Each structure stands twice: as C-alpha cells, then as structure tokens.
Write a new protein. Structure first.
Lengths: 403, 391
C-alpha cells in the first residue's frame, strides 16, 4: 500500500532538519516492490529532489554532506539520461570538484555516486542505451574538467590542487577498470600540446597497475599519439612519461608491434642519443602534429619509479623480438631507412650511437635468430610467433614453483 | 656426345672414383636440371652392371653405395624405381648391414637424398614427394615388422638392423615429424608395435626441434593418449607420459579438447601400485589393450602443468573425480583409493604457489573464456627478455 509515497515521505523528512536509518529502510522496502528501476517513480523522485534543491541547496558543508549522503542512497532507484546527468553535474559534481570539501568521507560519498553511474554490468538495465550514455557523459565531463583545470592560469594555487587531486584519483580509478574508454576520451585533447603531460601522468598511473584490458588501448588511436609524442616533442618530462607508457604497454601487444617497429627503432635512436646540453634530438617534421617544447613562451612532478624505465629496456625488447633488423638498423639507420621506406628525422653522432649500443649489446646473450632467419624473413614468417606460446607455459609453471 | 663420357666411367670403376666424379661435373654443366631420357639410360646401364656384378659382398657395397651416392642427383625416380633400389640395395643392406660406419654413411647419404628435398617440383609432376613417401613407408614397415617378428636361427644380426633403422627414422622425424607421425599411425593400432614406435617417437620429440605442433593433426597424439589410459605395460606407459609431457607445451589449443582425458591420465599414473601396477581400466572400446605377458619424467610434471593453466577444475576434479566426471559427462574407468589420491596430491600441491585464477574465474569461466589465454603473449615476451639477459 503506497511505497513510493512512504519513500518520498522519508526523503522529505531527512532533507528538512545526519540519520538515514528510516530512509535506508524505505529503500530496501521499496525495492522489494520495484526490483527493476521504475521510469515514472524515478521521474517523481527527481522532481522531489529538484524541489528541495531550490529550498536547501549545495552551498555549505553540512548540506553537501547531507546531500551526498542522500543521493548516494536513492540513486539505485533512478533511471537517468544524458540530460539528467547534466543536471547532477551542474547541481552537485561541478560545485564539489570545483571547490572540494576537505573531509575524506564526504569525497568518498561523491565517489560512490560517480562510480555507480560510471561502472555497471548490464547495459540494458535502465532500458535501451541509457546506462552506457550516462557513463559516457559523466566521464567526458570529468575528463574535460580535468584537462582544462590542468591548464587554465588561475584563485589560490592550493584550491586548484585540491581539485586536480580529486580528479586524478577519480580518473585513475576509472582508467584501471575501463582503460579503453578513458584513452578514448583522452585522444581528442591529446593533440593539444599543454595537455600532454597531465594526460600522460594519469595514463601511466593507470597502466602501472597492470590491470586487465590494457591491450584495448591501441584500438582507440591513443598508442599512436604516444608514439607521435615520443617521435616529435621535446620536453624531457613528457618524453619521459611517453617512454614509460610505451614500455609498459608493449608486452601486451606483439601485434601492434609489427606496424610500429620502424617507429620504435627511431624512438630507440632518439632516446639513446639524449644530450646533456641539447636534450633530445630535434626532429625535422611534425607534419600535422605540433610540437610541445618545455619553455614555450620563448602538472609535472614525475613519480620516483619511472627513472628505471629508460631506453636500455627498449633495447632489450627490440633485441629479444627483432634482433636482426634491430642491429641492422643500428650500425646504419639512414641506410636501413631508405630500404624500408621511412626517414630518419634526427641529426645524430654515429660513433656514439655505435658505442652506446655496443655497451648494452654486451649485456645480452647471443640471439638464435641469426641461425634461423634472414633480416627479411624475421619480418615475414609468422610461424616464429608459435615458439612464444611454448615459452609462456614453461615460464608459467616456473612462476608457480615454490622450491 | 655428352652422355657417353659418363657411361664409360661407370663401366670403368666397378672392377678410386676421381675420373667418374669429374665427368659428373661436366655432365651437370650441359644438363643443369635432370634429363628424363639420359636418366632412363643410366639406370638401364646400372641394371646390366647389376646382373654380372651385384650387391652380394662387402667390397661391392662399399663400391655400389659410393657410386650410387655420386650419380643419383642426375636421376629421376618414381614409386616403382625406389622399389627397384629398395629391392637391390636398401633391403639387402639394412637386412644384414655392413659393420663399417663410412659404408652406412653413404647409405644414409642416398636415403636422405630422396627423403629430404627443398623443391616439390624438381623432377616434374609430383615425383619427389611420391618417392620420399614410398621410401619412408618402406623404412617404417621394416622397422615395425623387424621389431616384432620372433627371430629364428641371429640376434646380434637383428640389433644391427634396427640400430640402423632407428638411426634413420629419428633423423627423419626431427626434420619431418608430421610425415613420420602419419606412417606410424596405422601400425600404432597394433599392440606390440607400440613400444618400438614410441621409443623412436620420444627420441624425435626429445630433440625439441621444429615443428612438433603439427603432430596432433595426424592423430598420433590422440593415439598416444588412448595408449595412456588403457594400456597396462609400465615401460610403454612410461614412454607415453614422456611423449605427452614433451609435446604439451607446443599445443595450448588441443588442450581445451583433451583436458578431461589428461585429468584421467594424471589420476591413473598417480594411483600406480607396487603390486597391481597401473589401474587396469574398463572400456577400451575398440582399442585392444597392450599388456606385458601376452601368452625419470613423471606424474608430478603433469600435475604442475595442469595446476598452472587449469587449477580450479584440476583441483575440483581431484577431491571427487567420479562427481567431476558426471557434470562434465565422461566417466572414471578405474577403481582407486580416494584418501591416497588426496594424500599424494596434497604433497605436490604444497610445493606450489597459490593461483590467481581463484580470484578471477569460476570453474566454468576457467573453461570458457578466451580472454584468459591472452595473458600468455605478455608473459612470454618477458620470459624471453629474461632468457637473453646475461647477468
């Protein structure tokens, strides 16, 4: 007998006065009746919520606490659409993120709400494509806000920080579960120079965690843009993140490798030739790309574990997988290039290249490809990549041995 | 006159080849590829020479093989011609072979000239393949027949024949494991062919050359598995297990479809008893069980392989095998002592780290989830990079 009416009753009560015991009980009670989300009750509850917003809004901490506490608990009753999540953005999320309450449990509550929308199993759950569309809208707004906040000039440095801190947290949590989706939002903005550092720092943090689905990222064209970054930009800090990112995502590909091989050769070249005085070899290129130099009138803070992710590991993976061509390429890059239809866009000192490269080469066992393939058949001949799945199994079993 | 120069030389030698060897050089110049009429001639000559001077004693063989070795790249042969050579040369040698290594060396030189080739079309039509396949078949047939047949009055003569055959078969296998596996298939169905065949087959696998992932297409793998679950003989079962352990790494795909069979074989091999030996099974079907008296790479390795890769099911299957068997539909052939399975498996389990699969999959998603097997690419790349670090 009237469970919508009891809910609205309880709802009304708790917003005019933080004890939610009555309300939680009604939600539980109510769900036993509408165990799937009801489109007219959603509509109704939202009008109640909007009504009360006019009366007592989000303008002080005690109210924000109350609001987040309540929204977090009703939102499983509602169906939302792209217009709706816009309303919550403007009424709740933007005002919090733009000037966040410095109490962790309040932010925790924000994150419950955000993440209820962002993360879900059934796409059919609110009818049609509503579920997916609200996630797409929310994340696009978070990303857009993050990117812009990371770049605008300034109203107290401390407060701007408080906002990025929240956004980075949220975006890393979202990234480790939805790496494709996040990379995809990031593509858009990444073509804009000053965004590259704030974006990459989030994307390397996502990928650090070595969570699942990392192999989806290249479909989105984000891996391509990181290579571009690595091929053309100039800022040590950015190229530093650039390399880190590609080093972590590489073992997850083997497939997008046979199309970026030459590009990785060139990247290896450039990073190995870094100069104390002239930094990274400048390119003669861009094309459409638009370079990011450091001091560019004429974010940041690289994490401590990224130093150990240098060009020496790039060598190891290239040598392990494409030794013949790799060493053929080193030793004469410009010659290798002309015969494989690409260009070297860096002035470099060949002796130095050959000394440094020797140095690393000497830490490696001799590669048995030289007994089996030619430089040309190393490239063709996909039979090679079977060996690989035998070596997997054996390493798997050894990983599982105790002693 | 080009060809006659050659033929004089062949007449000459058969009664120190330098002249012959040199005439073959000039011949090859005028006829870069093999010539069908010239070939026919030369073999027709050889056959006459055979009449009056054959393969019947040990100075003649050193000689014959030496010659046939050097001339044979000129020739073109067919299923019926290798029959001629089988009949005059190969069979009589292998049958009572000359105890001199360089003599047997020349033999192999010739055999492998036929068996291995870098060009299907070389002799026109589909001739090269025909020959290879004919020779390999006859080599197989004699190994099989010579291995089983009971011997009358001659046992050191026997060992010498198989010593050669084995040596030829293994060399062949390591280059052409698909092909050798095929030939062995029909013989394998016959109970006593199984040991001699496997002992050759493990020795091919052992060498971990290419391309062993072709073998299961031939059904040899399936036959060895049938062997593993039904046969009684320690020795043969011991080879069976050795074969599968060394073949398994190279599969990762036939695994999804032999899993329940592998579980059953792990059960059987671990339940081996000092007195009743392997669990005597009960089904066979049409298999025809090899027994013994008709008248160091063991089960812990298999445990490791199944625990990595299919931990949840493997362990759900131990603890209650018969139960696992219904619900997945196969059955358990053996009686066994459950508390002893539970004890033996606990010993091995305890040598292993705990498995991340229990945090990510159900028994059913562990079986039906293609995403899982993509982790593999990643780990392999890393192991590889580490194999190539030098300290």
């Amino acid at each position: 007998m009237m469970p919508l009416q009891s809910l609205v009753k309880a709802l009304w009560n708790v917003l005019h006065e933080p004890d939610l015991t009555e309300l939680i009980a009604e939600v539980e009670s109510y769900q036993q009746r509408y165990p799937k989300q009801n489109p007219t009750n959603s509509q109704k509850i939202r009008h109640i919520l909007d009504e009360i917003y006019e009366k007592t809004p989000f303008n002080n901490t005690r109210r924000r606490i109350l609001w987040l506490a309540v929204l977090k608990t009703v939102i499983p009753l509602l169906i939302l659409d792209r217009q709706a999540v816009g309303e919550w953005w403007d009424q709740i999320f933007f005002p919090f993120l733009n000037s966040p309450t410095q109490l962790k449990p309040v932010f925790s509550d924000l994150k419950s709400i955000l993440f209820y929308i962002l993360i879900f199993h059934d796409e059919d759950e609110w009818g049609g494509d509503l579920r997916r569309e609200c996630a797409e809208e929310t994340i696009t707004r978070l990303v857009d806000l993050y990117v812009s906040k990371a770049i605008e000039n300034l109203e107290s440095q401390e407060q701007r920080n408080q906002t990025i801190e929240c956004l980075v947290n949220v975006l890393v949590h979202y990234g480790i579960q939805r790496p494709k989706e996040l990379s995809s939002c990031f593509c858009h903005h990444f073509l804009n120079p000053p965004t590259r550092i704030p974006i990459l720092s989030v994307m390397v943090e996502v990928i650090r965690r070595q969570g699942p689905r990392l192999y989806e990222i290249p479909q989105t064209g984000f891996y391509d843009l990181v290579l571009k970054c690595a091929e053309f930009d100039t800022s040590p800090i950015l190229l530093s993140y650039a390399l880190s990112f590609i080093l972590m995502i590489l073992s997850h590909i083997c497939n997008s490798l046979d199309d970026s091989l030459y590009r990785l050769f060139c990247i290896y070249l450039r990073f190995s030739m870094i100069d104390p005085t002239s930094g990274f070899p400048s390119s003669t290129a861009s094309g459409n790309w638009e370079v990011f130099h450091d001091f560019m009138s004429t974010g940041s803070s690289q994490p401590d574990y990224l130093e150990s992710l240098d060009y020496s590991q790039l060598f190891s993976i290239l040598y392990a997988l494409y030794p013949i061509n790799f060493l053929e390429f080193l030793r004469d890059p410009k010659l290798y290039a002309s015969k494989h239809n690409f260009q070297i866009r860096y002035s470099f000192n060949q002796e130095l290249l050959s000394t440094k490269s020797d140095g690393l080469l000497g830490r490696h066992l001799a590669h048995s490809n030289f007994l089996k393939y030619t430089a040309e058949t190393e490239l063709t001949d996909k039979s090679r990549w079977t060996r690989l799945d035998s070596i997997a199994v054996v390493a798997l079993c050894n990983s599982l041995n105790a002693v």
